[PDB]
Design an enzyme around this catalytic site. Structure first.
Site, short mmCIF file in Angstrom:
data_model
loop_
_atom_site.label_atom_id
_atom_site.label_comp_id
_atom_site.label_asym_id
_atom_site.label_seq_id
_atom_site.Cartn_x
_atom_site.Cartn_y
_atom_site.Cartn_z
N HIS F 58 -2.59 50.17 63.17
CA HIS F 58 -2.29 49.61 61.86
C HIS F 58 -1.14 50.34 61.18
N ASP F 88 29.67 36.69 58.37
CA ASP F 88 28.45 37.24 58.96
C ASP F 88 28.71 38.73 59.22
N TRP F 123 -1.07 58.25 63.93
CA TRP F 123 0.33 57.86 63.73
C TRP F 123 1.27 59.01 64.04
N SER F 153 16.39 49.62 67.78
CA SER F 153 16.84 48.42 67.08
C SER F 153 17.41 48.78 65.73
N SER F 154 16.66 49.57 64.96
CA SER F 154 17.05 50.00 63.64
C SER F 154 18.07 51.13 63.66
N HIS F 237 10.29 62.65 57.09
CA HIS F 237 10.57 62.52 55.66
C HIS F 237 11.80 61.66 55.35
N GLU F 239 12.43 59.05 57.10
CA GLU F 239 11.88 57.72 57.38
C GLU F 239 11.17 57.14 56.17
N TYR F 241 11.92 57.99 53.15
CA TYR F 241 12.99 57.75 52.19
C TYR F 241 13.95 56.68 52.68
N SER F 252 16.68 47.21 41.22
CA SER F 252 17.85 47.29 40.35
C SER F 252 18.56 45.96 40.15
N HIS F 286 7.53 70.21 54.26
CA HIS F 286 6.52 70.18 53.21
C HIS F 286 5.26 69.47 53.67
N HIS F 287 5.34 68.67 54.73
CA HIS F 287 4.14 68.14 55.36
C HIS F 287 3.34 69.23 56.06
N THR F 312 15.34 60.93 41.28
CA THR F 312 14.42 59.81 41.10
C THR F 312 14.06 59.62 39.64
N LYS F 315 16.85 57.43 38.38
CA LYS F 315 16.71 56.06 38.84
C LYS F 315 15.48 55.36 38.30
N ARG F 434 -9.28 63.06 57.10
CA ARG F 434 -8.74 61.76 57.44
C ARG F 434 -9.17 61.32 58.83
C1 HEA Z 1 3.98 50.58 55.21
C2 HEA Z 1 2.94 51.39 55.05
C3 HEA Z 1 1.52 51.06 54.79
C4 HEA Z 1 0.95 50.06 54.08
C5 HEA Z 1 1.53 48.91 53.33
C6 HEA Z 1 -0.47 50.28 54.17
C7 HEA Z 1 -1.37 49.47 53.60
C8 HEA Z 1 -2.72 49.69 53.58
N1 HEA Z 1 -3.36 50.72 54.25
FE1 HEA Z 1 -2.62 52.15 55.35
N2 HEA Z 1 -1.79 53.63 56.25
C9 HEA Z 1 -0.47 53.87 56.46
C10 HEA Z 1 0.52 53.00 56.06
C11 HEA Z 1 0.40 51.87 55.28
N3 HEA Z 1 -0.79 51.39 54.91
C12 HEA Z 1 -0.26 55.14 57.19
C13 HEA Z 1 1.05 55.82 57.65
C14 HEA Z 1 -1.51 55.64 57.37
C15 HEA Z 1 -1.95 56.96 58.04
C16 HEA Z 1 -2.36 56.89 59.46
C17 HEA Z 1 -2.54 58.25 60.01
O1 HEA Z 1 -1.71 59.10 59.64
O2 HEA Z 1 -3.66 58.52 60.49
C18 HEA Z 1 -2.42 54.72 56.78
C19 HEA Z 1 -3.78 54.94 56.80
C20 HEA Z 1 -4.71 54.18 56.20
C21 HEA Z 1 -6.13 54.48 56.15
C22 HEA Z 1 -6.77 55.73 56.78
C23 HEA Z 1 -6.61 57.02 55.96
C24 HEA Z 1 -6.39 58.24 56.83
O3 HEA Z 1 -7.10 58.40 57.83
O4 HEA Z 1 -5.32 58.86 56.68
C25 HEA Z 1 -6.70 53.46 55.46
C26 HEA Z 1 -8.02 53.35 55.17
O5 HEA Z 1 -8.33 53.16 54.02
C27 HEA Z 1 -5.63 52.54 55.09
C28 HEA Z 1 -5.73 51.34 54.38
C29 HEA Z 1 -4.68 50.54 53.93
C30 HEA Z 1 -4.89 49.39 53.09
C31 HEA Z 1 -6.19 48.90 52.56
C32 HEA Z 1 -3.68 48.84 52.85
C33 HEA Z 1 -3.47 47.62 51.99
O6 HEA Z 1 -2.36 47.84 51.10
C34 HEA Z 1 -3.14 46.36 52.77
C35 HEA Z 1 -3.63 45.11 52.07
C36 HEA Z 1 -2.63 44.69 51.03
C37 HEA Z 1 -1.79 43.67 51.23
C38 HEA Z 1 -2.35 42.30 51.08
C39 HEA Z 1 -0.32 43.80 51.17
C40 HEA Z 1 0.37 43.94 52.54
C41 HEA Z 1 0.42 42.67 53.35
C42 HEA Z 1 1.54 42.11 53.84
C43 HEA Z 1 1.68 41.03 54.91
C44 HEA Z 1 2.82 42.57 53.27
C45 HEA Z 1 3.49 41.52 52.43
C46 HEA Z 1 4.95 41.32 52.79
C47 HEA Z 1 5.48 40.12 53.11
C48 HEA Z 1 4.61 39.03 53.65
C49 HEA Z 1 6.70 39.63 52.41
N4 HEA Z 1 -4.41 52.98 55.57
C1 HEA Z 2 7.15 55.93 51.58
C2 HEA Z 2 7.49 56.54 50.45
C3 HEA Z 2 7.26 57.94 50.03
C4 HEA Z 2 7.91 58.52 49.02
C5 HEA Z 2 8.97 57.93 48.14
C6 HEA Z 2 7.42 59.86 48.91
C7 HEA Z 2 7.85 60.71 47.99
C8 HEA Z 2 7.42 61.99 47.84
N1 HEA Z 2 6.45 62.59 48.62
FE1 HEA Z 2 5.43 61.86 50.12
N2 HEA Z 2 4.64 61.14 51.71
C9 HEA Z 2 4.72 59.89 52.22
C10 HEA Z 2 5.43 58.88 51.59
C11 HEA Z 2 6.34 58.98 50.54
N3 HEA Z 2 6.45 60.13 49.85
C12 HEA Z 2 3.97 59.75 53.50
C13 HEA Z 2 3.80 58.50 54.39
C14 HEA Z 2 3.43 61.00 53.71
C15 HEA Z 2 2.58 61.59 54.84
C16 HEA Z 2 1.27 60.99 55.20
C17 HEA Z 2 0.97 61.22 56.63
O1 HEA Z 2 1.38 62.29 57.12
O2 HEA Z 2 0.21 60.41 57.21
C18 HEA Z 2 3.87 61.82 52.63
C19 HEA Z 2 3.51 63.13 52.55
C20 HEA Z 2 3.87 64.00 51.59
C21 HEA Z 2 3.48 65.39 51.55
C22 HEA Z 2 2.60 66.06 52.63
C23 HEA Z 2 1.14 66.33 52.27
C24 HEA Z 2 0.30 66.67 53.50
O3 HEA Z 2 0.35 65.94 54.50
O4 HEA Z 2 -0.20 67.81 53.54
C25 HEA Z 2 4.05 65.91 50.42
C26 HEA Z 2 3.93 67.20 50.02
O5 HEA Z 2 4.93 67.84 49.79
C27 HEA Z 2 4.78 64.82 49.78
C28 HEA Z 2 5.52 64.86 48.59
C29 HEA Z 2 6.37 63.86 48.11
C30 HEA Z 2 7.28 64.07 47.01
C31 HEA Z 2 7.45 65.31 46.23
C32 HEA Z 2 7.95 62.91 46.81
C33 HEA Z 2 9.00 62.69 45.74
O6 HEA Z 2 10.16 62.06 46.29
C34 HEA Z 2 8.56 61.78 44.60
C35 HEA Z 2 9.08 62.22 43.24
C36 HEA Z 2 8.95 61.13 42.21
C37 HEA Z 2 8.63 61.34 40.92
C38 HEA Z 2 8.14 62.70 40.53
C39 HEA Z 2 8.37 60.27 39.93
C40 HEA Z 2 9.57 59.76 39.11
C41 HEA Z 2 10.28 60.82 38.30
C42 HEA Z 2 10.02 61.10 37.01
C43 HEA Z 2 9.37 60.18 35.98
C44 HEA Z 2 10.80 62.21 36.42
C45 HEA Z 2 10.66 63.52 37.13
C46 HEA Z 2 9.22 64.00 37.20
C47 HEA Z 2 8.72 65.06 36.52
C48 HEA Z 2 9.60 66.03 35.79
C49 HEA Z 2 7.35 65.57 36.81
N4 HEA Z 2 4.66 63.64 50.51
CU LIG Z 3 7.36 63.86 53.03
#
Ligand code: HEA
Ligand code: HEA
Ligand SMILES: [Cu+2]
Ligand SMILES: CCCCCCCCCCC(=O)OC[C@H](COP(=O)(O)OC[C@H](O)COP(=O)(O)OC[C@@H](COC(=O)CC)OC(=O)CCC)OC(=O)CCCCCCCC
Ligand SMILES: CCCCCCCCCCCCCCCC(=O)OC[C@H](COP(=O)([O-])OCC[N+](C)(C)C)OC(=O)CCCCCCCCCCCCCCC
Ligand SMILES: CCCCCCCCCCCCCCCC(=O)OC[C@H](COP(=O)([O-])OCC[N+](C)(C)C)OC(=O)CCCCCCCCCCCCCCC
Ligand SMILES: CCCCCCCCCCCCCCCCCCCC(=O)O[C@H](COC(=O)CCCCCCCCCCCCCC)COP(=O)(O)OCCN
Ligand SMILES: CCCCCCCCCCCCCCCCCCCC(=O)O[C@H](COC(=O)CCCCCCCCCCCCCC)COP(=O)(O)OCCN
Ligand SMILES: CCCCCCCCCCCCCCCCCCCC(=O)O[C@H](COC(=O)CCCCCCCCCCCCCC)COP(=O)(O)OCCN
Ligand SMILES: CCCCCCCCCCCCCCCCCCCC(=O)O[C@H](COC(=O)CCCCCCCCCCCCCC)COP(=O)(O)OCCN
Ligand SMILES: CCCCCCCCCCCCCCCCCCCC(=O)O[C@H](COC(=O)CCCCCCCCCCCCCC)COP(=O)(O)OCCN
Ligand code: CUA
Lengths: 78, 236, 64, 55, 57, 530, 51, 268
Positions: F58, F88, F123, F153-154, F237, F239, F241, F252, F286-287, F312, F315, F434
């Protein structure tokens, strides 16, 4: 009162990874038993160190790599 | 300790290392509610009060006197909040004067402690595994997937120093009531130093995935007193 | 004019058809855990009371 | 030497560009023979790979 | 300097004169042995440097 | 048609697959959340395998087969030809392999589950868990190849966008005057280029350590599994972003169209948008705070990944400045783009709480992380994908989408997925780990609260299929009755109704000045700007 | 698609003029995509003892 | 006039007919990746489907390339910007293939910058003997410094207009590279440590391993740069199929010199 005793800070390995602390104290003990043997009390500070902070299968490993001469570290100071 | 059903906060702090986290999780979220309090207000004054504005003020674009204000504003809270975040990093490697060395090695479905410090009079390490009890052998009253069969005893008011590693797949060592979390890398080993300050059992979990039996690995640990611990060490 | 109520009658009739569809997949569900039925939960409290697990806070552990 | 000669043939050919070479008739029917086998035989062994039947 | 090494490989492939020097645990690894043959180290490998005799003992 | 090299008809094949992989990527998350409804394995009988298979089954369909091919392929192959002024793409023949390897990236993944083992690796495919002594069959062999077909592809799907923007513009389109959706993807294309070859070595080395036993990662031989934790996460990270910068491009455009006003600080929004992309490179461990790094190395990252919250904030506060003065026309792309501004930013506050090395040591691998990264994936990259479909659906398909029925699909997504992902912060602050099929009994509280919501969001997705049915069958009979909204910009206060039909679309982009649908040659003359 | 920029002719579907109703071929593309994990939960349970 | 201007294209950028080799290469990448993971686990018996998958892929590249040279010299939408499109599309591409070395250079700085415990405390470890840089590896650096002085000796010579230096100057560069394959075939046949020789055996046949897997396509790139220049395809004012070969080698001096300093000089 306070009967417990263990190895202190060991400032040459101050990080979280203490694997070279386990490795070099195995080295510094077994380099002491072959070269400059006059007593055991400054020689068992490297024996009492590597019994701590080391697993039992690793000491079984390090005493098996030493036995076929396949110890990757320098075991023979002499 | 024990998790609570329908809870929302930390488990009870039994370590000053754990007690520092609770005063940093609240030091951060105090500066997160001003930002959430601003955004939840500045999005309700726009959707409600400005959806009934038919004349759009379409000649305000640059705003030089407010452009430079909100780029030092995340540079004025983060400079403040990092100083309690630096004081916790440099004061959680305090392995200067320890008092005890215990081991914890995970072989993918259990743990394997050994008390290789030879304060015990027998002069031998005490190694013992930690298997979770299955549902068929479940004694009525035991916590499911949270209570093992062979637990682990540690004294109180003592400067212990763990060593955590493995000989197989990575899976970490997590007790949330003590704030200890290290990876158990297979090739190397990690340490933590957590002074426990109260008697009682702590239950934890293994966090990092190992395989099929990831749910079947708890970390049970109880704290007893130092004479009461020594009565266990002279037995086994 | 008669359309803002049709929005709020699809939301509040989407939560009903969600939960009503949740019961069909739960009644077609496997047998639950044996450690939940209020009496396993009871005797796992004086086991914690005799050990002082959560001194300040709650260790009730009771949710049948 | 053949650059102006092929340019008479390629320009205003009214053919697909992968059929516009004069030395292209033999380039395709053996190529469509190795294409008609390399996309089924990696996939026909998949029901053989579901029952544990390996080699 | 190629010819002094081309004659150097003829010494090791001739005789070891006792056995191999019992190479370390990282030098030879055979978890999941290879698939194009039975135990082939790579696509092309001469036994002058890649003998790999098992020492169970 | 199948192998037509027109960039318009490729991006409609991209979007035809990102819902098929969507309704497979969320049917797996249905069964995942159905198993976390009660303690004890309910629907899966006793199998803790096929749960680390479904989680990786998933989480990679959502990342690499939904949000990657829609926000980069499904839109970038349709809008970056169109808004800039190209006919194109610059490389239109490799534009077709960038789609047609994605179903071949699906046969390399659905057959990775049907084989005897099942890739129960998660994953983040870690080396000793996925090693050949642990995972024996050909299950994880295909799961590390379907991740390679999408990696390739990407990658050429972003070389297609650096030599489109840099030379194939119009006359007056200088380098400081572009649409922000193009500056989203052109900045993204300098992260897709400089992070995917890092990944392609970090997977092939795991292939070499599994059937060629080379010991890049094998412990018997000194190969660390901790090298993987900084080499995969060097891709990881950037990916995440990349799933948000085209998400920062659509928002925007929407929030400054349905507010009749240009965006606040456009030159300020393009410099704080590559600074996210550039500084996102320098924060990649940081992960892995707890994996045993140094006391100064973690001291650097606890100060360096907080600086991602500097641009951010620019933005976001500018999106709270570009709608302050102007009007607000609350149609469906404005509803998503205004709930994106509340649920993504709450996924940012949980970001800077996790960002500290002094606080990740009580939060790693818990459910507090999954509460954080789902407020910025299903609420920051689905809230900008639903706000991009509804913003360009009748302009591109030609048919309107029953606007009264797309408002109830917004609210069932808003409150029907906030009910899932808000109590995850409570299960993780206690310490539920998890990827587990079962849990201690005290974690049955919110895991039944978060289980009632996955039927709410996936009932809205069943409704979204019917909106796609109402848009294709009698989607022409929508703009002739009062079902939908036709003009996305209502005229001004002193703009008369009879003069509006002369000067109808007051857009700031070419995308609406085209016909609906656009022509097969919508640019047969070099257009001019200013 | 190379030419004929009509209304339904930029999509590889056949919406109008189909012999069979379109809800067969539209839900039958999106429910089939919904039923692929429910055959991964079938041939991996029946292989591994469960049903 | 305007009547011929209404019969031509009005924008300089190229429009391509629908070719089916897009889905041919895609079907080959399926049967590459699917079949290379089956024979590692059985189900076939023989290792020749991968050899089939390397044959249907590479003939699909030249049929892709036969249509491109049909557009390069026989249809010709190559204007100034489209010439700058590929010349920047390939110069930005090799930034990706120079960063994949940083996915292999950084492993060498992961096992030698900090000494490990499973090996010795020295790099290269005991039991493993490395080749000094004052040997046949020093021939590998000078033969590319001579290659870097003959690829530009024949770069301007084709523009110079005479075919005595343009044709013959690329045959002497082509056999300068096939002879570079055979001296990197000596260490693949005469060196002590193997691919399975631990972590030193891993990254040494990876950093120099991928540097060997590019000469099979570079010599194949000269295999058409001599055939086209003999069949009069390439020109002296518009050459893309010749310009991408020089930048394939002018950056190769930089990466091999960074490969020589840490694998051999710092690697002993
Ligand atoms: C793109 C990223 C993405 C999205 C959208 C989701 C969406 C959801 N995810 Fe998932 N999820 C992950 C990425 C994502 N997840 C990742 C990386 C992990 C961790 C795996 C690992 O590290 O072990 C994870 C893990 C994860 C867990 C396990 C937690 C753990 O073990 O770490 C669970 C269980 O609750 C969960 C649930 C859901 C649910 C309920 C949604 C719901 O939001 C989905 C239902 C909502 C929808 C209806 C909207 C989406 C449907 C579409 C079709 C999109 C629409 C777009 C077009 C059609 C235009 N996700
Ligand atoms: C897809 C989008 C996405 C985005 C945008 C971000 C954005 C950020 N993520 Fe996250 N992150 C994930 C997706 C994302 N992350 C995923 C998939 C994982 C890992 C899960 C996995 O391993 O399965 C992860 C994991 C992850 C970890 C690892 C935790 C762990 O596994 O132990 C940490 C910790 O540092 C982190 C931090 C952040 C931070 C600091 C930002 C920052 O960029 C965000 C900052 C934004 C703001 C703060 C808000 C707007 C700003 C303000 C209003 C003004 C400024 C704010 C203040 C002064 C407070 N992310
Ligand atoms: Cu990160
Ligand atoms: C895998 C794919 C599976 C897909 C299955 C998804 C099913 C979703 C179906 C949603 C749907 O089709 O609804 C749209 C349909 C047409 O609406 P319209 O936009 O043309 O405007 C109508 C006018 O403007 C106002 O309509 P009016 O107000 O006059 O009717 C009242 C209507 C409102 O109540 C409800 O919506 C909930 C019951 O009540 C009824 O009709 C009750 C009749 C029994 O509106 C309706 O009439 C809905 C009737 C109920 C259908 C069943 C509901 C199940 C939850
Ligand atoms: C119509 C049929 C009604 C059935 C009676 C009922 O209330 O059932 C409760 C169901 C099932 O709940 P359950 O306890 O998980 O039942 C399955 C137990 N097995 C068989 C798996 C061991 O549980 C449910 O249906 C969900 C109950 C909790 C939610 C209450 C409603 C919330 C609506 C909020 C709207 C705003
Ligand atoms: C997608 C499809 C797959 C794309 C990647 C394929 C590349 C890997 C192919 C490896 C094939 C193989 O079996 O290689 C073995 C070679 C030979 O190694 P050897 O012959 O044992 O060398 C030792 C010398 N002796 C002691 C014999 C004298 O050992 C080597 O030197 C290996 C050379 C290749 C190094 C590849 C590095 C990978 C980096 C990432 C690339 C991603 C693109
Ligand atoms: C930024 C946003 C990120 C998300 C942050 C997640 C929460 C952060 C921690 C704040 C939690 C505060 C809860 C305080 C509390 O103890 O209330 C619980 C009950 O509240 C309830 O059951 C209802 C919970 C309502 C909490 C809403 C939190 C909003 C965030 C700010 C507040 C106590 O219950 P108990 O655990 O003692 O019950 C034992 C049964 N035996
Ligand atoms: C922080 C969180 C912000 C969240 C989003 C808020 C969006 C606000 C946008 C407001 C419009 C921006 C703007 O440029 O307004 C200017 C003045 O506002 C301002 O100056 C804003 C106030 C700045 C803080 C107060 C500065 C001290 C003022 C002392 C008053 C007591 C008007 O510019 P203009 O029309 O005057 O320009 C004419 C030159 N002839
Ligand atoms: C009418 C009698 C037949 C059953 C329906 C009773 C209506 C009152 C609510 C109880 C129904 C029910 O079983 O769901 C309760 C939870 O409430 C809910 O989920 C909401 C119920 C209302 C909708 C279960 O709760 P429980 O304590 O009855 O037993 C649960 C297993 N032990
Ligand atoms: C890695 C793949 C190559 C990366 C660089 C591709 C971009 C520069 C080369 C180039 O422009 O030709 C492409 C064809 O190459 C290709 O499509 C061949 C790459 C796919 C087969 C790879 C075989 C490796 C052996 C574009 O093709 P185009 O027809 O769209 O350009 C129409 C020109 N006016
Ligand atoms: C390795 C993976 C490589 C991936 C793709 C790399 C492509 C780089 C070159 C891009 C082609 C540029 C181009 O269009 O030049 C045209 C042909 O080049 C070409 O056809 C170059 C062909 C390269 C073949 C080498 C790749 C595999 C070889 C076969 C297996 C061994 C000639 O245009 P022009 O300038 O001559 O037009 C003058 C007419 N008057
Ligand atoms: Cu051991 Cu998870």
């Amino acid at each position: 009162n306070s009967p417990l005793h263990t190895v202190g800070f060991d400032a040459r390995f101050p990080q979280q990874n203490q694997t070279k602390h386990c490795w070099q104290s195995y080295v510094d003990y077994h380099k002491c038993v072959n070269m400059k043997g006059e007593d055991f009390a400054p020689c068992k500070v490297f024996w009492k160190t590597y019994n701590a902070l080391c697993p039992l299968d690793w000491i079984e490993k390090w005493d098996d790599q030493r036995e076929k001469g396949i110890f990757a570290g320098d075991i023979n100071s002499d | 300790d024990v998790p609570t059903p329908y809870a929302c906060y930390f488990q009870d702090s039994a370590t000053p290392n754990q007690e520092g986290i609770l005063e940093l999780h609240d030091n951060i979220m105090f500066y997160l509610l001003v930002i959430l309090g601003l955004v939840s207000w500045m999005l309700y004054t726009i959707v409600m009060t400005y959806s009934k504005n038919p004349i759009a003020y379409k000649y305000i674009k640059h705003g030089q006197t407010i452009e430079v204000i909100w780029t030092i504003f995340p540079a004025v809270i983060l400079l403040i909040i990092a100083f309690p975040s630096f004081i916790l990093l440099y004061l959680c490697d305090e392995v200067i004067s320890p008092a005890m060395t215990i081991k914890a090695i995970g072989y993918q479905w259990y743990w394997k402690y050994e008390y290789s410090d030879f304060i015990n009079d027998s002069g031998e390490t005490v190694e013992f595994e930690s298997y979770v009890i299955p549902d068929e052998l479940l004694e009525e009253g035991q916590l499911r997937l949270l209570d093992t069969d062979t637990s682990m005893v540690v004294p109180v008011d003592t400067h212990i120093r763990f060593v955590v590693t493995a000989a197989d797949v990575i899976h970490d060592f997590a007790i949330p009531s003590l704030g200890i979390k290290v990876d158990a890398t297979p090739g190397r080993l990690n340490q933590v130093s957590a002074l426990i300050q109260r008697e009682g059992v702590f239950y934890g979990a293994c966090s990092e995935l190992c395989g099929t039996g990831h749910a079947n690995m708890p970390i049970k640990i109880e704290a007893v007193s130092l004479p009461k611990f020594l009565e266990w060490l002279n037995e086994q | 004019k008669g359309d803002s109520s049709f929005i709020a009658k699809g939301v509040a009739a989407g939560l009903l058809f969600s939960v009503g569809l949740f019961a069909v997949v739960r009644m077609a569900g496997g047998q639950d855990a044996k450690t939940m039925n209020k009496e396993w939960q009871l005797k796992s409290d004086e086991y914690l009371k005799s050990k002082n697990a959560n001194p300040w806070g709650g260790y009730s552990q009771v949710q049948s | 030497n053949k650059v102006i000669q092929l340019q008479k043939i390629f320009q205003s050919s009214t053919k697909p560009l992968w059929w516009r070479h004069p030395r292209s008739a033999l380039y395709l029917y053996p190529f469509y023979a190795i294409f008609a086998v390399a996309v089924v035989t990696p996939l026909l062994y998949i029901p053989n790979a579901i029952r544990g039947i390996k080699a | 300097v190629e010819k002094e090494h081309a004659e150097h490989r003829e010494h090791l492939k001739h005789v070891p004169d006792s056995e191999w020097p019992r190479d370390y645990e990282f030098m030879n690894i055979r978890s999941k042995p290879f698939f194009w043959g039975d135990g082939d180290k790579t696509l092309f490998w001469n036994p002058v440097v890649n003998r790999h005799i098992e020492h169970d003992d | 048609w199948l192998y037509s090299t027109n960039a318009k008809d490729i991006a409609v094949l991209y979007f035809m697959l990102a819902i098929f992989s969507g309704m497979a990527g969320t049917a797996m998350s249905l069964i995942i959340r159905l198993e976390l409804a009660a303690p004890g394995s309910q629907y899966l009988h006793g199998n803790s395998q096929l749960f680390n298979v479904l989680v990786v089954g998933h989480a990679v369909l959502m990342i690499f087969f939904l949000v990657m091919p829609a926000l980069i392929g499904g839109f970038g192959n349709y809008l970056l030809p169109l808004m800039i002024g190209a006919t194109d793409t610059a490389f239109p023949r490799i534009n077709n392999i960038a789609f047609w390897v994605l179903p071949m990236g699906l046969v390399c993944l659905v057959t990775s589950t049907l084989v005897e083992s099942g890739a129960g690796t998660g994953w983040t495919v870690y080396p000793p868990l996925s090693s050949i002594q642990a995972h024996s069959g050909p299950s994880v062999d295909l799961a590390i190849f379907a991740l390679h077909l999408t990696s390739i592809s990407s990658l050429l799907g972003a070389i297609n966008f650096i030599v489109t923007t840099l030379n194939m513009r119009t006359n007056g389109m200088t380098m400081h005057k572009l649409p922000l959706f193009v500056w989203s993807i052109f900045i993204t294309a300098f992260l897709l280029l400089l992070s995917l070859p890092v990944l392609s070595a970090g997977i092939t080395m795991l292939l070499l350590d599994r059937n060629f036993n080379t010991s890049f990662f094998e412990v018997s031989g000194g190969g660390d599994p901790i090298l993987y934790e900084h080499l995969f996460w060097f891709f990881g990270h950037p990916e995440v972003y990349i799933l948000i910068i085209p998400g920062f491009g659509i928002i925007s455009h929407v929030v400054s169209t349905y507010s009749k006003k240009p965006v606040f600080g456009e030159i300020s929004m393009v410099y704080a948008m590559a600074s996210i992309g550039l500084l996102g490179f320098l924060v990649w461990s940081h992960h892995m705070y707890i994996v045993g790094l140094d006391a100064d190395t973690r001291a650097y990252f606890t100060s360096a990944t907080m600086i991602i919250a500097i641009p951010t904030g620019i933005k976001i506060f500018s999106w709270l400045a570009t709608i302050h003065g102007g009007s607000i026309r609350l149609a469906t792309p404005m509803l998503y783009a205004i709930a994106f501004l509340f649920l993504f930013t709450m996924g940012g506050l949980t970001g800077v709480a996790l960002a500290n090395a002094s606080l990740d040591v009580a939060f790693h691998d818990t459910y507090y992380v999954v509460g954080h990264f789902h407020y910025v994936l299903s609420m920051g990259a689905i809230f900008s994908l639903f706000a991009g479909y509804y913003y360009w659906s009748p302009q591109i398909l030609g048919l309107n989408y029953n606007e009264k029925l797309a408002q109830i699909q917004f609210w069932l997504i808003f409150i029907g997925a906030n009910v899932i992902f808000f109590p995850m912060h409570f299960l993780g602050i206690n310490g539920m780990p998890r990827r587990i099929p079962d849990y201690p009994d005290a974690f049955a509280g919110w895991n039944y609260v978060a289980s009632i919501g996955s039927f709410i969001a996936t009932l809205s997705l069943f409704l979204f299929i019917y909106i796609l049915y109402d848009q294709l069958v009698n989607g022409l009979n929508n703009k002739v009755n009062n079902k939908s909204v036709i003009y996305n910009k209502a005229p001004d206060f002193v703009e008369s109704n009879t003069i509006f039909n002369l000067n109808t679309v007051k857009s700031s982009s070419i995308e609406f000045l085209l016909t609906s649908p656009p022509a097969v040659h919508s640019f047969n003359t070099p257009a001019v700007q200013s | 698609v190379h030419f004929k920029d009509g209304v339904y002719e930029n999509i590889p579907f056949k919406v109008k003029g189909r012999k069979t109703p379109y809800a067969l071929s539209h839900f039958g593309f999106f429910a089939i995509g919904f039923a692929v994990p429910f055959v991964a939960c079938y041939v991996q349970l029946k292989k591994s003892g469960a049903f | 006039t305007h009547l011929e201007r209404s019969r031509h294209q009005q924008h300089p950028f190229h429009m391509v007919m629908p070719s089916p080799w897009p889905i041919v290469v895609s079907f080959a990448l399926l049967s590459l990746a699917l079949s290379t993971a089956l024979t590692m686990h059985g189900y076939i018996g023989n290792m020749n489907m991968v050899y089939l998958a390397l044959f249907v892929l590479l003939t699909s590249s030249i049929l892709w390339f036969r249509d491109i040279v049909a557009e390069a010299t026989y249809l010709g939408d190559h204007t100034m910007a489209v010439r700058k499109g590929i010349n920047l599309g390939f110069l930005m591409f090799v930034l990706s293939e120079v960063l994949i070395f940083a996915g292999l250079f950084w492993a060498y700085f992961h096992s030698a910058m900090s000494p490990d415990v499973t090996l010795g405390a020295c790099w290269p470890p005991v039991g493993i003997e490395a080749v000094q840089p004052t040997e046949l590896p020093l021939l590998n650096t000078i033969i590319l410094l001579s290659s870097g002085a003959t690829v530009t000796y024949s770069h301007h010579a084709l523009i110079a207009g005479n075919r005595n230096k343009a044709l013959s100057g690329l045959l002497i560069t082509f056999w300068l590279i096939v002879i570079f394959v055979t001296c990197q075939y000596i260490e693949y046949t005469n060196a002590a440590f193997t691919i399975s020789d631990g972590v030193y055996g891993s990254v040494f046949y990876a950093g120099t391993g991928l540097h060997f897997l590019h000469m099979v396509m570079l010599a194949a790139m000269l295999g058409v740069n001599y055939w086209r220049m003999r069949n009069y395809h390439l020109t002296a004012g518009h050459h893309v199929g010749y310009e991408t070969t020089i930048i394939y080698t002018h950056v190769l001096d930089v990466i091999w010199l960074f490969l020589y300093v840490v694998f051999y000089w710092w690697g002993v």
